[PDB]
Amino acid sequence: NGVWNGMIGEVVTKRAYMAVGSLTINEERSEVVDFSVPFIETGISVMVSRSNGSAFLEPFSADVWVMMFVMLLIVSAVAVFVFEFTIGKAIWLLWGLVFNNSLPVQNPKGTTSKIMVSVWAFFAVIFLASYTANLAAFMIQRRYVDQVSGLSDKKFQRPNDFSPAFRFGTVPNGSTERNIRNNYLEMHSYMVKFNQRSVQDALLSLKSGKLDAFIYDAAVLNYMAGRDEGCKLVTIGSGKVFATTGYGIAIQKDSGWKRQVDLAILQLFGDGEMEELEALWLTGICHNEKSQLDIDNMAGVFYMLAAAMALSLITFIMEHLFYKS
Amino acid sequence: KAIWLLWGLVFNNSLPVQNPKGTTSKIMVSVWAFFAVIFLASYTANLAAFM
Amino acid sequence: YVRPTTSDGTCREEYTINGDPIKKVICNGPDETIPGRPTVPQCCYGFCVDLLIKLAREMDFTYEVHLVADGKFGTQERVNNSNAAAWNGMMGELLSGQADMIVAPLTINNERAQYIEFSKPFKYQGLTILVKKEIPRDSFMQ
Amino acid sequence: PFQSTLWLLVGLSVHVVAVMLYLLDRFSTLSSAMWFSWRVLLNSGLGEGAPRSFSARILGMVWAGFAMIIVASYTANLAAFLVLRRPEERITGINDPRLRNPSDKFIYATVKQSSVDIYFRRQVELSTMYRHMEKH
Amino acid sequence: ITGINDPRLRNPSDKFIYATVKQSSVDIYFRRQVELSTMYRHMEKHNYESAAEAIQAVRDNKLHAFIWDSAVLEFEASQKCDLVTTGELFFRSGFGIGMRKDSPWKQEVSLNILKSHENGFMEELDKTWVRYQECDSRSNAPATLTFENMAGVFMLVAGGIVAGIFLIFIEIAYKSRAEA
Ligand SMILES: *[C@@H]1O[C@H](CO)[C@@H](O)[C@H](O)[C@H]1NC(C)=O
Ligand SMILES: N[C@]1(C(=O)O)C[C@@H](C(=O)O)C1
Fold first, then answer.
1. Residue C118 forms beta bridges with which residues?
2. Residue in C46, C60, C64 with CA at minimum distance from that of residue C104
3. Residue A59 near residue A97, CB atoms below 8 Å
């Protein structure tokens, strides 16, 4: 309403000259009290579990398909020549033989087709081996891109657009919550239900389930990313935070030790102490590593196959248009 | 003979002959085939893992 | 970014990857193109420029920009007696008043900080090293 | 490797395809297509039947490609299986933040009056960390 | 380069250069700081005058390594991807607009800067001016590429097919001849 609360009150009441802590910075407080320069890179951020939302299809490197076309040309020519709808059948067999054999019909008697089949078979084992190995390699070596890639995607903006209810919350009476209410109303009005008592408890809502995503200060979320009983929690994207800010320190007004403080601060990094202090206090053991049961991307390719089946229906329709001709 | 076919089906197929007509054999063949594909995947994966 | 204004004509309608026309402003700065170095009228467009004009719409002020003669931003230097001269570069222009305000990518440090006031950081970044990536890792035989 | 949600759906669509194929055949059979789906999927090659039709042929080729993709999924998951070590369980260095981030919950134990304790007491540089070692 | 503290830096070499700009603020970090004061001198050798030349040396491969603050560097890292940034930003700092202490307009400026941060204005501006288009972490993600690599196997198989053509020709001549 009309009145301020917290340490800032004791700074205003002159019960505190300077206030120190994890306090974030904002325009209002900078207006009322002079702030120290930011010592650490921080801000609003997200902390979520490893839900991933056809990187297996991608190992093709756009080559497997192109190869398939080239293969088509080679098969067609070879089949047409060798014997010295049926051709299409023979190349159906060759195409089957390409992928893990599994083609029922009629290897052509013609001799050249046999040798060509042998070479093609070597090519096929090569196709299986290459595709599978690259797939396994992607099963290894993955950056694991996450839920909101845009991060402004508005999936956050409305839960209701997504049929299952989504969930995200933050600690109230925060600079984060006030900022949210200032810029994004709907998010605030929706998230009030998902607001949590304390960071350990907010963590309880994330950790035990019953909540998907958690949002909080970036330094705390990064340290918590590094420090967890198991490495079950990670940051969002590169943890690159919007509302880029740093922790400041209160003073009264234009009259203060002021600049003298500021100099001291950059002497601290100036001697490189902050890196040491970062390794001791801030550095977490986790996130050194960067691991799950298969997820949605396989479902995507699976859907792609379904869509291709639709294409079989379209080719059936084209064939029907053709039959009249 | 039938088990020669089943054994072939066990390792990467590559066996020519005569899947038995008997209906039950189709289902038994299906379950066993699943076991066999599990065997191929496991063997190849374990080989790569030891690599 | 620096490009000269084409003849008398001012600035290109060149567009950002997100469809927007690129904004631009005139800046007088050092030119190495001529054998002698003239302070040359130029066109400059930037992140800091968009920020500056953003402020200019927000702030009562009007802006005229010229790039500092020295390629360096600034560093303390020269003569021994008393404390003599002043740090060469745009910062030196700021104390001198050649420019009343400095808009550039300037890191913020205490040694400089005592001399001048510093605006809250628009950006947060730290030093790092650039080295070429490419050392590879080609036949089915391999 | 494949969640039962993944696994059931693949079978449902398996039938849903063999049937679309079968149905395609019947419309313009049940045993033929069901066994065709399973045969095409498993490389069983019952060889009893194949559809001549373009729709059917294309669906089958895409189907086989999908079989290759599924065997690939078994392999990917097995590869995911191969990462034996979890991110945790290591004390990274002589100076470990897990020590630096002490916890009442996570004990770090030593013997009092052991020479190590003398290392903790005599040394100023790690002297803070000493208390975490000193306790209990 | 393993870290801000790199044994490779710590183990300097005339053979392995590490390059910077004299009078760049980094140099002020080297001179002002006592703790690394020894390490400064190795950097002092073979300094470049400007940013473009410094990036170019690494690109030209004249100099094996280049040291500068990330904000200028990462954008370039995106720009080429032939070159990469490594390790953790050290000397963590920020970029700001200079004014004399006596001028009160700066009071508004910071007040404005913060107001520009909260709305995500900066985020969108960095998003515009940092392209991010083409590059990745190089070590582990070859798999996106590899079309050419497969081609290096497949072309051989195909050459096998061309052999198939010669063999076929031989069979065709020899067979009709064989039973003639
Ligand atoms: C936040 O403050 C309001 C009153 O200002 C209070 O009713 C509410 O319970 C507080 N929430 C927490 C988590 O402290
Ligand atoms: N540092 C915070 C502040 O109010 O200054 C607490 C934190 C949060 O609630 O996310 C921001």
1. E98
2. C46
3. no
Is E69 known as a binding-site position?
A: yes
Say if ligand 1 is within 6 A of residue A173 CB: yes
Task: Give backbone dihedrals phi and psi of C7, rounded to 5 degrees, phi first.
Answer: 45, -130
Q: How far is A269 from chain C, CA to nearest CA, in Å?
A: 9
Cβ separation A41–E92 shorter than 8 A: yes
Nearest of C87, C88, C91 to residue C106 by alpha carbon = C91
Sign of CA dihedral E127, E133, E134, E137: positive
Nearest to A101 among B13, B44, B45 (CB): B13
Q: Please tell me which of the candidates A63, A78, A271 has its beta carbon nearest to residue E35.
A: A271
Strand order in the sheet with C117-118: C101-102, E98-99, C117-118
Beta bridge partners, E84, equal C131
Nearest CA in chain C to E112: C55
CB atoms within 10 A of CB E155: 13
Other CB atoms within a 10 A radius of the CB of residue A283 amount to 22
Q: D30: which chain B residues are within 8 Å (Cβ-Cβ)?
A: none
Interface mutation target, options A141, A153, A187, chain E, most CBs of E under 10 Å: A141
The count of other CB atoms within 10 Å of the CB of residue A287 is 18
* Of residues E8, E23, E95, E96, the one with CA closest to residue E54: E23
Question: Which CATH superfamily, name and number, covers E1-95?
Answer: Periplasmic binding protein-like II (3.40.190.10)
Instruction: Extract the tokens encoding C91.
Output: 């910062």
Paired tokens of E137: 């972490």
Which residue in this structure is represented by tokens 């053991």? A285
Write down the architecture of domain C1-121 according to CATH.
Answer: 3-Layer(aba) Sandwich (3.40)
The class (CATH top level) of A40-53+145-248 is alpha beta
Q: What is the resolution of this structure in A?
A: 3.8
For the stretch D126-129, contacts whose Cβ atoms lie closer than 8 Å and that sit 24 or more positions apart, written own/partner, are D129/D99, D129/D100, D129/D102
